[PDB]
Design a protein around this ligand. Structure first.
Ligand SMILES: CCCCCCCCCCCCCCCCCC(=O)OC[C@H](COP(=O)([O-])OCC(O)COP(=O)([O-])OC[C@@H](COC(=O)CCCCCCCCCCCCCCCCC)OC(=O)CCCCCCCCCCCCCCCCC)OC(=O)CCCCCCCCCCCCCCCCC
Ligand SMILES: CCCCCCCC/C=C\CCCCCCCC(=O)OC[C@H](COP(=O)(O)OCCN)OC(=O)CCCCCCC/C=C\CCCCCCCC
Ligand code: HEC
Ligand code: HEM
Ligand code: HEM
Lengths: 79, 239, 378, 64, 55
């Protein structure tokens, strides 16, 4: 009982629009795609990376240390 | 609490994405398997019908099964009688049962080589290494009387009395039979036996990309049409 | 007159798909859930052409799959679609869930609670029928999981033998596990038909967190095409994985036919459980350990009422966005731990993840949502 | 016969020679005593890796 | 293998011939009916067999 007749109430506003057949669908895709990514990646490259960055360190530390005490046990296997 | 020897990599002739199988190596590996090594494993899942499209021609193929005659099943007036053999039958087993196999070869069963390739961490490369790099045992290490030193084994020793070396066989095609070449032909045969759908796979995997890779750039365009009604509106306010 | 609005069958589908008010900013992320539906119809369909052939004979089971992946037309394709098309149905789940902990999507109490049940049912069918290819990994994981539920002080002795039909895996077990696969599946589909009944009557969401009844566009021509486009994009990756490198996501230890005479050296399940198996063995005390294993799918119903912010979604909450990315990295280190033998730091380190999956969303997230309420005066 | 030749040629590199000196030094250590913990379990692996790394490249080329 | 065992509780009613095809050899090409369902597979029943015997 919440179809397109009865919802919120609004007043004094206006909007315009064309058709699709009187326009082209590629307005400078090449020369506007790159700047958007350039401006937005900077903002959230800092918000997804640093949490993930402290796993590379612990993983490499553990891997190389275990490799030592598996491939180089005869170092401390003193005769 | 010990080490292991991870096999290297080789530029195998079938290693690519869009490559194939040399269909002359498998043919020559079949004789190697039969004459040299075909005693210690079962090869049960591979019948005599599976080589006609790979290695031999049919009238060339029937004469192989005839030589090895096997017991047949019970029937009236001559149950369990000998018979020449037919195409369908599976590769004749060497041994009666688990107990005789254990007794004859130091209580350790010999694995049946039908999934021996897929079930090894590594694969065809590890198989090629294990059959070349044997070495004499080091100093100060004890070993069993029936055990022979091998550095590719987790136990570093296995009951495999070396079965492969130079000029144990004769390649009928006119090839100077060196240990490396025969081992290579054997490995190329064995992987194919472990998974024959290689050659019929990489072709539909190619007639999938070309067809899709041009229909999908269509759907995009019909999309753009529809969503291009709504990205062109202006929205002003006047109280 | 208008046949689309007076026929008893087409009122139902016009009101449900073709003509429902929908927002207009929805992120692609609102995309994935439909994909799951595509997966659901494909796992059922491909999975009946195996129970046609398979034989619940304890010394006939393993050779069955071995003859199907050789003997019949195109069976090598279908086996692998069934083994790989659920490595991805489990891909979908972790995205459709994690988003609802970004765009405040739990305030739908009714929708949210008929969820977790489905999570439990789907997660259990795969274990319940990855033990009947009948191989060593299948038997030797079955034994290990079985021996835990038997550590209940008075529960354990009796329940364990009812599923074996004896003392150990025989003809009496494979038969009733193969009983299980058939029925969990059909029952699950009806819970999915009810998830959506709730959805009508609140409408969808939008990635800002503000009710927009002002500007709702239809769900014909727009959502219909966006959906079809992305869906015919899941069939690129699925088929490239299966028909280029199938053997990549598995293990080479369901090939030696099942025996009690061997025992696998480095047993470990497939990737997508090793998370709810790394808590388990991380701690001593078997009776307790089973309890901490299910603390997790029920940690979730406890998180609609720990909410302590004034706004919905993380888009306008730049300080909480830090804590949501130390949750997923936690679940990635915790899956690197599990499928690997026990050494010196593995025990100490896997431990931290277990301590933290709980300290992040039990203490921290309800106490760090006020430090910022105090900053915008609500 | 090609493989023995190529193994000979691939022995002369720095890795293999510095591995062989280590191996024979360890064997000099071990041969003097009998209760010692040392076999050739470790340096021999170094020798094999040093050989095989280089051997694995040019071997398949020398085929007919 | 192919040796003889005394027999235990599990074992079935021993069958006379190596194969049923031996029956036509000695019994004039008339294969004897099996006697597990001979009661239910007949009009009459347990009174057809009796009336066969004294007849
Ligand atoms: C089936 C198998 C499932 C796996 C599918 C993978 C995920 C697919 C998906 O749904 O993502 C939708 C999403 C579609 O983008 P959208 O419709 O514009 O908005 C959805 C985002 O959630 C909205 O994000 P946004 O538009 O607001 O911007 C966020 C994003 C920037 O997002 C984008 O703009 C991606 C589109 C850029 C065009 C790429 C052209 C090719 C280069 O920047 C970041 O914060 C990411 C951190 C920095 C990475 C920089 C790389 C950007 C390229 O795809 C991506 O975001 C691509 C990047 C994510 C890949 C992560 C994988 C890392 C490994
Ligand atoms: C685990 C094993 C399964 C492996 C699956 C691999 C999961 C990797 C997910 C890939 C996502 C990482 C790259 C995403 C690209 C990106 O960062 O886009 C930024 C984008 C910005 O969005 P805005 O609305 O514009 O916010 C305002 C910004 N000024 O951020 C987002 O959209 C975040 C969306 C969150 C999706 C979460 C993905 C899954 C994470 C799960 C966390 C833990 C879940 C725990 C559940 C366990 C039980 C199932
Ligand atoms: C001397 C008889 C004999 C010959 C000839 C022989 N094998 Fe074996 N092989 C055995 C026995 C016995 C074992 C079991 C070793 C054990 O488990 O102790 C075995 C085991 C193996 C293994 C080890 C499998 C594993 O799990 O490590 C491989 C590999 C193998 N054989 C390959 C071959 C191939 C290929 C050939 C043909 C070129 C061959 N052998 C010829 C007797 C033989
Ligand atoms: C949510 C739905 C389902 C999931 C997630 C699922 C999962 C699985 C998985 C992971 C396997 C392992 C197969 C292998 O490793 O080779 C399997 C096997 C099997 N499933 Fe399903 N399954 C589902 C539905 C069904 C249904 C509905 C049926 C029958 C009505 C079914 C019948 C079988 C059979 C017979 C096998 C064994 C065949 C084989 O191993 O090749 N499954 N299932
Ligand atoms: C077989 C399992 C599941 C299926 C088929 C499924 C399917 C769906 C579908 C079709 C939608 C609506 C379409 C959309 O929002 O994109 C949806 C929404 C939702 N689902 Fe599920 N789901 C499943 C499991 C789960 C689980 C495990 C949860 C865990 C909480 C969950 C929670 C939700 C929530 C909160 C929404 C609301 C989406 C919104 O924000 O509008 N579902 N699901």
């Amino acid at each position: 009982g919440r179809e397109f007749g009865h919802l919120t109430r609004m007043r004094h506003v206006i909007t315009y629009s064309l058709s699709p057949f009187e326009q082209r669908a590629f307005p400078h895709y090449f020369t506007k795609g790159i700047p958007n990514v350039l401006r937005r990646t900077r903002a959230c490259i800092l918000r997804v990376a640093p949490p993930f960055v402290v796993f590379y360190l612990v993983y490499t530390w553990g891997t190389q240390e275990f490799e030592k005490s598996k491939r180089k046990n005869p170092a401390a296997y003193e005769n | 609490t010990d080490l292991e020897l991870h096999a290297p990599s080789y530029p195998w002739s079938h290693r690519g994405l869009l490559s194939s199988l040399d269909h002359t190596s498998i043919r020559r590996g079949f004789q190697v398997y039969k004459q040299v090594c075909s005693s210690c494993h079962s090869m049960d899942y591979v019948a005599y019908r599976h080589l006609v499209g790979v290695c031999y021609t049919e009238e060339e193929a029937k004469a192989l099964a005839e030589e090895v005659e096997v017991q047949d099943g019970p029937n009236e007036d001559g149950e369990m009688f000998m018979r020449p053999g037919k195409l369908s039958d599976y590769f004749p087993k060497p041994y009666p049962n688990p107990e005789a196999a254990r007794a004859a070869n130091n209580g350790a069963l010999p694995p049946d080589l039908s999934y021996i390739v897929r079930a090894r961490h590594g694969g065809e490369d590890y198989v090629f290494s294990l059959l070349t790099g044997y070495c004499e045992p080091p100093t100060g290490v004890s070993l069993r009387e029936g055990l022979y030193f091998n550095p590719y084994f987790p136990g570093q020793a296995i009951a495999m009395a070396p079965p492969i070396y130079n000029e144990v066989l004769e390649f009928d095609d006119g090839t100077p039979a060196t240990m490396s070449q025969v081992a290579k032909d054997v490995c190329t045969f064995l992987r194919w036996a472990s998974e024959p759908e290689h050659d019929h796979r990489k072709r539909m995997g190619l007639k999938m990309l070309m067809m899709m890779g041009l229909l999908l750039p269509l759907v995009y365009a019909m999309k753009r049409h529809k969503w291009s009604v709504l990205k062109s509106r202006k929205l002003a306010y006047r109280p | 007159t208008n046949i689309r609005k007076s026929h008893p069958l087409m009122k139902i589908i016009n009101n449900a798909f073709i003509d429902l008010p929908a927002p207009s900013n929805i992120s692609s992320w609102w995309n994935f859930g439909s994909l799951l539906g595509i997966c659901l119809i494909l796992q059922i369909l491909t999975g009946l052409f195996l129970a046609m052939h398979y034989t619940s004979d304890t010394t006939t089971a393993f050779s069955s799959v071995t003859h199907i992946c050789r003997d019949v037309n195109y069976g090598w394709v279908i086996r692998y679609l069934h083994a790989n098309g659920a490595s991805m149905f489990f891909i979908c789940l972790f995205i459709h869930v994690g988003r609802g902990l970004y765009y405040g999507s739990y305030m739908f109490l009714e929708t949210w609670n008929i969820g977790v049940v489905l999570l439990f049912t789907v997660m259990a069918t795969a274990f319940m029928g990855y033990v009947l290819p009948w191989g060593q990994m299948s038997f030797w994981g079955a034994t290990v999981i079985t021996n835990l539920l038997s550590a209940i002080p008075y529960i354990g002795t009796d329940l364990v033998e009812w599923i074996w039909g004896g003392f150990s895996v025989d003809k009496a077990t494979l038969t009733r596990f193969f009983a299980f696969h058939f029925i969990l599946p059909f029952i699950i589909t009806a819970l999915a038909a009810v998830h959506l009944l709730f959805l009508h009557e609140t409408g969808s969401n939008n990635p800002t967190g503000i009710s927009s009844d002002m500007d709702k566009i239809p769900f014909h021509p727009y959502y219909t095409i966006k959906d079809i486009l992305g869906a015919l994009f899941m069939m690129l990756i699925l088929l490239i994985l299966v028909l280029f490198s199938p053997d990549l996501l598995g293990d080479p230890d369901n090939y030696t036919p099942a025996n009690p005479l061997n025992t696998p050296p480095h047993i470990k399940p497939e990737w997508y459980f090793l998370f709810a198996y790394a808590i388990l063995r991380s701690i001593p005390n078997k009776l307790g350990g089973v309890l901490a294993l299910v603390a997790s799918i029920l940690i979730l119903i406890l998180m609609p009422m720990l909410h302590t912010s004034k706004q919905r979604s993380m888009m306008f909450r730049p300080l909480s966005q830090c804590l949501f990315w130390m949750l997923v990295a936690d679940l990635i280190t915790l899956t690197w731990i599990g499928g690997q033998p026990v050494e010196h730091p593995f025990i100490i380190i896997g431990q931290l993840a277990s301590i933290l999956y709980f300290l992040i969303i039990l203490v921290l997230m309800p106490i760090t949502s006020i430090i910022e309420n105090n900053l915008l005066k609500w | 016969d090609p493989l023995t030749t190529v193994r000979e040629q691939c022995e002369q590199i720095e890795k293999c020679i510095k591995a062989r000196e280590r191996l024979e030094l360890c064997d000099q250590r071990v041969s003097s005593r009998s209760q010692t913990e040392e076999d050739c379990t470790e340096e021999l692996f170094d020798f094999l890796h040093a050989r095989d790394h280089c051997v694995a490249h040019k071997l398949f080329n020398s085929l007919k």
